[PDB]
Amino acid sequence: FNGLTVLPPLLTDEMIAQYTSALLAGTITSGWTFGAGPALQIPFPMQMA
Amino acid sequence: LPFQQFGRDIADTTDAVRDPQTLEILDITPCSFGGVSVITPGTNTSNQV
């Protein structure tokens, strides 16, 4: 009421959740390769090995 | 209450008042305010805003 305003964040909560889901899927299916280049698939037991 | 004429917010600003002519209660809300922002590309490119 006295001239103090809060501004909305640029990225909504849903977009943040989508980014986290993308990172999580990438780290599940590709190990660490997608971070350092193109995503190469790898079975999860072999990534754990 | 019968004795109470004014009402204040948590942050000590008036949010309610009692009419003297007629014993009624009114919620006082400040008139709308906002920060005008202008979206424009470079003036060299165009003059639309």
Which approach determined this entry? cryo-EM
Closest chain B residue to A1 measured between Cα atoms? Answer: B30
- Give φ, ψ of A16 to 5 degrees: -60, -45
DSSP helix, strand, coil percent of chain B (3-state; round to 5)? 0, 20, 80
Sign of the alpha-carbon torsion through A27, A32, A33, A34: positive
Closest approach of A19 to chain B, Cα-based (Å): 28
B2 touches chain A (CB under 8 A): no
> Are A33 and A40 a contacting pair, CB within 8 Å?
yes
User: Do A5 and B35 count as a contact with CB atoms less than 8 A apart?
Assistant: yes
Amino acid at A14: E
* Distance separating alpha carbons of residues A34 and A24, to the nearest angstrom: 11
Resolution (A): 3.7
Cβ atoms of A23 and A35 within 8 Å: the answer is no
- A3/B30 Cβ within 8 A: no
